[PDB]
Amino acid sequence: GERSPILGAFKTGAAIATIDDWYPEATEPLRVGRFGVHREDVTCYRHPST
Amino acid sequence: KLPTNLAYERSIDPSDVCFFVVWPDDRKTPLTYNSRTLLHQVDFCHVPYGASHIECSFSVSFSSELRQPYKCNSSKVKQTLVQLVELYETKIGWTELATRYLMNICNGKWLWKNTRKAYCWNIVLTPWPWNGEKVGFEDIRTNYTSRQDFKNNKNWSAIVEMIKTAFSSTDGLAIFEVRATLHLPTNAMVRPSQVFTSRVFQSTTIDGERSPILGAFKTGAAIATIDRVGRFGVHREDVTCYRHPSTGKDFFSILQQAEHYIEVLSANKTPAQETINDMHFLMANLIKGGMFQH
Amino acid sequence: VSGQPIKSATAEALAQGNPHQVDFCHVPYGASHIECSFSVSFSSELRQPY
Amino acid sequence: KWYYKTITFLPELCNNESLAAKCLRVLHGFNYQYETRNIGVSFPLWCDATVGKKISFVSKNKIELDLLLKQHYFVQMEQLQYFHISNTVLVPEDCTYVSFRRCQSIDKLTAAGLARKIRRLEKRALSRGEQFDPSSFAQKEHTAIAHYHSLGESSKQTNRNFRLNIRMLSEQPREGNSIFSSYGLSNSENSFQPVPL
RNA sequence: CUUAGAAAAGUACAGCGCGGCUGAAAUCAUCAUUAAAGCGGUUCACUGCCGCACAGGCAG
Helix, strand or coil, rough: CCCCCCCCCHHHHHCCCCCCCCCCCCCCCCCCCCCCCCEECCCCEEEEEC | CCCEEEEEECCCCCEEEEEECCCCCCCEEEEECEEEECCCEEEEEECCCCEEEEECCCCCEEEECCCCCEECCCCCHHHHHHHHHHHHHHHCHHHHHHHHHHHHHHHHHHHHHHHHHCCCCCECCCCCCCCCEEEEEECCCCCCHHHHHHHHHCCCCHHHHEEEEEEHHCCCCEEEEEEEEEECCCECCCCCEEEECCCECEEEECCEEEEEECCCCHHHHHCCCCCCCCEEEEECCCCEEEEHHCCCCCCCHHHHHHHHHHHHHHHHCCCCCCCHHHHHHHHHHHHHHHEECC | CCCCCCCCHHHHHHHCCCCCCCCCCCCCCCCCCCCCCCCCCCCCCCCCCC | CCCCEEECCCCCCCCCCHHHHHHHHHHHHHHHHHCCCEEECCCCCCCCCCCCCCEEEEEEEHHHHHHHHHCCHHHHHCCCCCCEEECCCCCCCCCCCCEEEEEEHHHHHHHHHHHHHHHHHHHHHCCCCCCCCCCHHCCEEEECCCCCCCCCCCCCCCCCCCCCEEEEEEEEEEEHHHHHHCCCCCCCCCCCCCEEC
């Protein structure tokens, strides 16, 4: 009966899936995506030009 | 120069201040306040008769979240800011900012006006990570009233050191748990934070009953009052704001001189009058965080 | 935008107070430790395309 | 038979709370300097946000009331165009009777009054019994009270600015005693004598 | 200063009988809202009395 804060199901999925560190100049893991998008830095690696 | 996306995250993380009443039996009960309404709401909070001393406790945690921007549209300004932070740390050091942030923790600045008419109030905190006894300050009113008075403490160098390491090393972190003891007069007025909307306080339920509180943001203002640190030198009481954009010493007019500051910090000894103070202001704003988008 | 300061930004205007409303969640005083729990399952649905 | 005279605060920029407080002050002074307590005080008009712009003194004895309104304060304010005084008018039979009772409850409802009450209980604990603990007593979370004006006063024997408050309420139109406390209050310890508008 | 000058279209009325829209169904895969914050009583409602009163009344 009490509303409680939660962590979204898709957000926790975005957490345990942060394993991608195979991009060309990798330093830290990223969320596994079709275009290896970084969030702390806006620009995304693994661009189709690469 | 300002990228379309540029955000920082705060390094100092103060918490709420919860007031406790200590009885002669040393048993502690949460402070409570009365609310009066007319048939408009006015709130009154006083120390109950027979109470020994009011006790206030909160936790403040430092972290190294100013090392790199939280978000950054362009990579150039990201490495610019990172290099600026590294050069400031290596050339000037974190001692001044650490001492200014720690003095407000220890001298009871976060109590605001609650310490106006108290006979004596003590500040004792337990840092983390720690390896010995708790750091203790006794009778701040008479004993500890200056930087020299604070430095003459038994382990003032040790506590201020862990703040420097927390600010310098990545993942570095220092946690303090402050506990004030206020020997207020009989039925003395206690002034907590008033909620935005007459006099009505902020309240959180403790031990099943409501209690007056000092807002986390409000306590952060007292901890960060080192100049209050902000984009402009905004003064709460007198409306006018110093460091106006016309004065050329706001955050943005200083931030956009990042290349010049990088050149100065690495060429020769920086002047302690102009460049050092600008660096202190820049890093103080970085610690607070925020968005510098446009 | 990328220009001189706006003329109307006097001392008072830049130092007024702008209210905000946020949701504040914090550990209650007197507690011991926050506990979080969730469930994740691994399946073999990657072998054959949907 | 009751007789009354009224005075109106002519200036528009004035705190009628303060003016009524001063009026009650001189009234109390007269009620001591002389032994009589015949004259009461009534406000012909009353507003929930402020006491009325007129104060009317009601007494059973005509001579006592007229002599009271010859006090130095009233005379030295009359020629200053700050006061307008009516000579005397017999109480109409169409008037209404209400009581401006002073409330001692608020003085204890306030926080320092609660502290005073607990201290008084501690002192009266000299009557033998188990020593009580102040921790048991606590203030109410919420308090709701009716409208009041709390005119204001300052003690003369000692420099304590005790603030008197009065609550208006209707009462039975007959009470022949015509007695009051040091101030006209309709809450005299003996009885709650009504006053006319 | 009028295609100017003038003018009563009115009396009655029954739309009624009868009806089977029925058969069948998969909407369908993936998803980080994130960063930052003082709403501010300078005095003002104090101190005594009674009553056993976390009762209710007194005065200055």
